[PDB]
Assembly symmetry: C3
Homo-oligomer: 278 residues x 3
């Protein structure tokens, strides 16, 4: 798809792009943005309006292109896996994310000293991906600890990411989900799927509708709909699971509907049983 937006970029004096903010997708309106242009000598950066036009099926070719792609995902214009992100790690700079805005990592010690004359300097994160909410708050969502949702996360209407939840870029919820565990990059969960506290979903992997991952559980395989993984139980691709009297590697149960995975507390054996009613 040809996608375009007008945004405001933060550039170092050597021309490295620390960030871009695109408030709206597909608009040429600049009036939100002209008051934000200028030069900050304490950070040694310039903020300047840019217009970015991309082919979402092509690999990104520069830092601006990479930033627009993350915005398209978090504004929910594009779902996870629908936009080409190949090579994005190479295009994003490591940035010090502060209460004063993004700062270059090279020379940060001098930067911090300059900024400290203006007020206390707090560093929220040092990374190539910022906190999503600092660029877009999608509608119909709650996020307890907004450090734990990267820009490029897709959070469908009706999602709650609790404080223990984490959602990486190119990942998230396609419908209404309670997310209290970790959704790795490239993982999606479909409508009504709830991820219990401290649960882990490995990234290849997606879960269908109305799944339940128990607290402290783990899922290393794709699941279909109406599956349950018992609290505390980690299903790896290599786990051998007893189903109807036979052992199956979990990788072969990928995409199954209506299975409850538990570890028998008497024998210690991993079992899967049908999820009755459904």
């Amino acid at each position: 798809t040809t996608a375009s937006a007008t945004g405001i970029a933060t550039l170092t004096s050597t021309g490295d792009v620390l960030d871009v903010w695109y408030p709206e997708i597909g608009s040429t309106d600049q009036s939100a943005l002209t008051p934000l242009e200028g030069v900050d000598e304490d950070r040694n950066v310039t903020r300047k309006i840019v217009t970015t036009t991309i082919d979402i099926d092509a690999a990104p070719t520069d830092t601006y292109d990479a930033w627009l792609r993350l915005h398209l995902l978090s504004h929910r214009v594009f779902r996870p896996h629908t936009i080409n992100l190949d090579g994005i790690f190479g295009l994003l700079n490591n940035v010090v994310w502060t209460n004063f805005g993004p700062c270059a990592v090279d020379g940060f010690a001098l930067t911090r000293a300059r900024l400290s004359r203006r007020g206390q300097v707090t560093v929220y994160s040092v990374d190539k991906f910022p906190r999503m909410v600092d660029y877009v708050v999608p509608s119909g969502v709650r996020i307890g600890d907004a450090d734990r949702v990267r820009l490029g996360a897709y959070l469908a209407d009706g999602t709650t990411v609790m404080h223990e939840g984490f959602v990486n870029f190119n990942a998230g919820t396609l419908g209404a989900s309670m997310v209290e565990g970790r959704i790795s990059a490239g993982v999606t969960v479909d409508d009504g799927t709830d991820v219990g506290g401290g649960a882990s979903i490995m990234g290849v992997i997606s879960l269908g509708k109305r799944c339940l991952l128990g607290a402290n559980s783990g899922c290393g395989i794709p699941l279909g709909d109406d599956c349950i993984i018992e609290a505390g139980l980690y299903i790896t691709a290599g786990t051998k699971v007893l189903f109807d009297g036979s052992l199956h590697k979990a990788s072969t149960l990928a995409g199954s509907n209506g299975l409850i995975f538990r570890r028998d507390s008497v024998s210690g054996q991993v079992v899967a049983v049908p999820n009755t009613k459904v």
Copy 2:
């Protein structure tokens, strides 16, 4: 109980209450609060003093009432389960919690643009419950990552909530505890109980005194005093536990004193044994 306090409320131009801060319980002193009244046109809110009087045994009837109840818990005037919270979710608004203060979720994009002229806008959370410490810091407590304690948490003197700890509203510690795992809404742990790193306590559930939940453990049943759950072991209500040669569903071991729960590493069987010395 009749409870009353004077506080300062933040109201949208449509009269929705985004927050109330009650610095003290039971006082009519306004002199801390009159300098904080006014109108913020970038957020489109008004801050105004309110006096709120409630019956803690009755269901809350409006947003102010709900906010006072959360304060009563976190100031430790009332313990968890001692105040009626029925319907509170319906009375609290979803709010964008920023470095500039609370902001309405509707229209936040315009709000963010207005505020960005004043300085970098950082969103800490988007939720119906704020961070406790932004309203009350109780005495004798440490909190590593104060994003992870909701207003309405009760943290007794001598509590440390480490960065991996999480304490929901209507929950917490009745005495001195090291909390490095998740205390769900309506869960309390009694004096000397330590919750290990990444442990999960389901919410009906409380733990007694001097309990130890191992790292990455889970507890889905009430426990009495001097119980231990091995690291990595999740006791669900349905788990069948071997105790003195017989199998018992864990729900039937609810409230037991002096049991150590472990998963036998040879057989894989969940067992409970007496906690000797005690």
Copy 3:
């Protein structure tokens, strides 16, 4: 070692040290620091330059000494366990860490009210240890959620601490590691060791090179090089592990090289097998 640095201390009106910032180790240059000296009457603190000289092998004797030691670790001048920290907990004050800077816990309610006239007051943490990044950002590191790295953490070049990672003081990475779980105080992991999401390493304990702790795993013993602990599996010192037909308490497998620990999904038995290729 004799170690010395010039820094800027924040002192209460009773002379308690809330913090010290030492921008550089071993320098007498004050020109970064003289613009930061002064008195803040809303917090009731004074900021003043100090010169601190210590013997790293001796126990710290005052709060300034304790702060310099934490800096020496996070600037990577000293590795974990190389500096004497005995009694440090007694020398650090509990502090309220705010957007305005450190504040005393005694009297914070009055402090908060004073500061609220200047702007929204946000409390990041209440603890004896601050967030490392607010004092030093070491080179070659990423940190997703910088609430989760305490000052006194040592993060070697090439380390990424993801949002689920946590690194305590006197702890961390000796080389390039992806850290998505919890590195307790006094724990180190050597080059190429990756700590999976939600994994727990107990603190006596270190891991060698190229180890892999699966998501939601736990390690209660020292490991040598090229060990793997399966996702979801917690090895406690007391766990009895089957290796080559014999049962061994895990404490006796301390420091082993090239072992893969798994829980057999059929029998529920904890086993260790050689890590083939290596």
